[PDB]
Amino acid sequence: AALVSGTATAGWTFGAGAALQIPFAMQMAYRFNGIGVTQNVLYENQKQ
Amino acid sequence: PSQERNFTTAPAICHEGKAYFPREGVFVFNGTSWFITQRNFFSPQIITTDNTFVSGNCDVVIGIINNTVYDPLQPEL
Numbered sequence: 001a002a003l004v005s006g007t008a009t010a011g012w013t014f015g016a017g018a019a020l021q022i023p024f025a026m027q028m029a030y031r032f033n034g035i036g037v038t039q040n041v042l043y044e045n046q047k048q
Numbered sequence: 049p050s051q052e053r054n055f056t057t058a059p060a061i062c063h064e065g066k067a068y069f070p071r072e073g074v075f076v077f078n079g080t081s082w083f084i085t086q087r088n089f090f091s092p093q094i095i096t097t098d099n100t101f102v103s104g105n106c107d108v109v110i111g112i113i114n115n116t117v118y119d120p121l122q123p124e125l
């Protein structure tokens with residue numbers, strides 16, 4: 001439970017260093033870019 | 049990475065009615081000024097056209113805010 005709660009907002013440093021707080025949607029947008037789909041796609045289709 | 053700071057962010061900025069998105073970094077609001085920088089190290093840069101991109105209007109982007117975008121053309125011309 002702690003792990004999931006943490007990762008939900010903690011992001012990339014969660015298991016590496018100091019905790020940070022990143023807005024959920026911002027984190028997701030990045031991970032999409034991490035695959036190879038332009039970041040803006042997520043925001044436009046955020047609802048879907 | 050370690051010692052950090054609190055900043056306000058934005059999914060995108062609106063300029064000339066168009067939705068501008070960051071390239072490799074994130075938009076960051078400092079003590080009354082917007083910049084763009086990499087997530088892993090706070091080093092703020094001026095927001096310029098060539099360091100961002102534009103796609104779609106300021107219509108469907110949630111949390112989009114108003115801002116300006118620097119264009120070298122102005123001082124160059």
Ligand SMILES: *[C@@H]1O[C@H](CO)[C@@H](O[C@@H]2O[C@H](CO)[C@@H](O[C@@H]3O[C@H](CO[C@H]4O[C@H](CO)[C@@H](O)[C@H](O)[C@@H]4O)[C@@H](O)[C@H](O[C@H]4O[C@H](CO)[C@@H](O)[C@H](O)[C@@H]4O)[C@@H]3O)[C@H](O)[C@H]2NC(C)=O)[C@H](O)[C@H]1NC(C)=O
Binds near residue numbers: 114
């Ligand atoms: C980023 O910056 C943009 C630009 O400022 C903001 O978008 C604007 O938001 C405002 C407020 O919603 C829109 O206001 C427009 O005002 C026009 C003037 O009429 C009003 O003000 C006069 C002042 O004396 C009063 O007398 C009058 O009674 C009104 O109170 C309106 O004419 C505009 O109406 C438009 O939409 C209607 C919709 O049916 C149309 O019928 C009209 O013909 C017209 O299109 C409107 O109300 C302003 O237009 C917005 N501009 C843009 C470009 O969107 C963003 O909100 C801001 N972002 C953030 C996050 O704040």
Ligand SMILES: *[C@@H]1O[C@H](CO)[C@@H](O[C@@H]2O[C@H](CO)[C@@H](O[C@@H]3O[C@H](CO[C@H]4O[C@H](CO)[C@@H](O)[C@H](O)[C@@H]4O)[C@@H](O)[C@H](O)[C@@H]3O)[C@H](O)[C@H]2NC(C)=O)[C@H](O)[C@H]1NC(C)=O
Binds near residue numbers: 078079080081
């Ligand atoms: C948020 O971003 C804002 C926009 O960048 C920041 O505003 C800037 O704040 C600094 C304060 O450090 C102002 O600096 C001015 O610099 C001039 C020039 O002299 C200084 O630099 C020379 C270089 O060798 C040095 O020798 C001198 O001793 C000075 O250090 C000074 O004359 C001014 O008094 C002042 O120091 C920037 O100009 C200012 N930018 C703008 C556009 O106003 C803001 O501080 C940032 N806030 C946070 C919390 O980071």
Ligand SMILES: *[C@@H]1O[C@H](CO)[C@@H](O[C@@H]2O[C@H](CO)[C@@H](O[C@@H]3O[C@H](CO)[C@@H](O)[C@H](O)[C@@H]3O)[C@H](O)[C@H]2NC(C)=O)[C@H](O)[C@H]1NC(C)=O
Binds near residue numbers: 052053
């Ligand atoms: C980023 O902002 C958050 C808050 O939005 C900061 O966390 C909060 O920091 C304060 C001060 O360090 C913590 O203590 C508080 O002090 C006030 C002083 O009067 C007191 O009234 C409060 O009851 C409390 O003691 C506060 O607990 C803390 N809150 C949380 C959830 O951490 C955070 O430190 C900021 N980060 C950076 C890098 O600035």
